[PDB]
Ligand binder design. Structure first.
Ligand SMILES: OC[C@H]1O[C@H](OC[C@H]2O[C@H](O)[C@@H](O)[C@@H](O[C@H]3O[C@H](CO)[C@@H](O)[C@H](O)[C@@H]3O[C@H]3O[C@H](CO)[C@@H](O)[C@H](O)[C@@H]3O)[C@@H]2O)[C@@H](O)[C@@H](O)[C@@H]1O
Ligand code: CA
Ligand code: CA
Ligand code: CL
Ligand code: NA
Ligand code: NA
Length: 257
């Protein structure tokens, strides 16, 4: 008469928040030191230790969540962002000539979500809930990572149901571990799969850090129907203000709810 449930309580925890839904993710920004090539290599830091550093500010309602930050080239014709693959020599930017500025200093810009900060050296935390329209397997991916990132899905993994705005939880059970290894870079097209049931809200956390110059995090998901959603997650990601009083908010096992 009923489904048997995923084996060994293996279903990912989801949520049914009852409050006012808002489109998009919240992005919190935290201090990260220029040219610090070690802090971001610790799992504890990328899961929650980032929030022990100074919080710089925040922006809400973000649906286009990929990162593609290019440093300036101060050129003969003005100052323009340089795609990393167009940088050359010591140094110039293709179509611009030689650049007079250093690749090794901090730069200030609104390129990350409109928030004025130093995209060269920062950590950010994206939170919200992913709403699957289809029941099945979802494959999240980072096409590349510069410098360090994680993605976590699920209640008690990304954050607690109905508690999006709380200090980070301590889970290191990342869905995608894109942490910069101690020994030098990771492979591209890093991925993690989650089985999701339609209509339930799945906590989603992305933590991303840049230590110097370029920053890159192209985020995608492959849906059960085999199509891919890249960069702009409008229609899939939502936020809810905390409601720690909502007793029934956590769905430990969506296949038997
Ligand atoms: O062929 C390129 C380069 O090769 C040799 O130089 C190698 C490296 O020398 C140093 O360690 C640094 O200059 C590296 O440059 C990276 O790091 C500095 C910070 O120390 C950045 O200012 C610079 O933009 C560059 O950053 C890249 O790597 C970072 C760490 O992985 C990323 O965070 C960043 O986004 C970017 O990808 C040099 O690469 C020499 O032969 C030299 O002549 C050549 O130009
Ligand atoms: Ca819990
Ligand atoms: Ca970088
Ligand atoms: Cl050129
Ligand atoms: Na880029
Ligand atoms: Na610029």
């Amino acid at each position: 008469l009923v489904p048997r449930g995923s084996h060994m309580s293996g279903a990912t925890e989801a949520c049914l928040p009852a409050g006012q839904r808002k489109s998009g993710m919240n992005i919190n920004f935290y201090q990260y030191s220029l040219k610090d090539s070690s802090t971001y290599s610790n799992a504890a830091y990328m899961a929650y230790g980032y929030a022990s550093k100074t919080k710089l500010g925040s922006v809400g309602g973000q649906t286009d969540i990929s990162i593609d930050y290019n440093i300036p080239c101060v050129s003969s014709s003005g100052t323009f962002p340089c795609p990393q693959e167009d940088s050359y020599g010591n140094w110039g930017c293709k179509g611009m000539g030689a650049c007079s500025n250093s690749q090794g200093i901090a730069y200030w810009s609104t390129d990350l979500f409109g928030f004025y900060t130093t995209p060269t050296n920062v950590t950010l935390e994206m939170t919200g809930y992913f709403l699957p329209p289809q029941t099945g397997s979802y494959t999240f991916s980072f096409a590349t990572v510069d410098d360090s990132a994680i993605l976590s899905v699920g209640g008690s993994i990304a954050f607690e149901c109905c508690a999006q705005e709380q200090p980070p939880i301590t889970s290191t059970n990342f869905t995608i571990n894109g942490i910069k290894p101690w020994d030098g870079s990771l492979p591209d097209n890093i991925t993690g799969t989650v089985y999701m049931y339609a209509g339930y809200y799945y906590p989603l956390k992305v933590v991303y850090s840049n230590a110097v110059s370029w920053g890159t995090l192209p985020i995608s998901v492959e849906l059960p129907d085999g199509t891919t959603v890249s960069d702009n997650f409008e229609g899939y990601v939502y936020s809810f203000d905390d409601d720690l009083s909502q007793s029934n908010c956590t769905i430990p096992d969506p296949s038997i709810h």
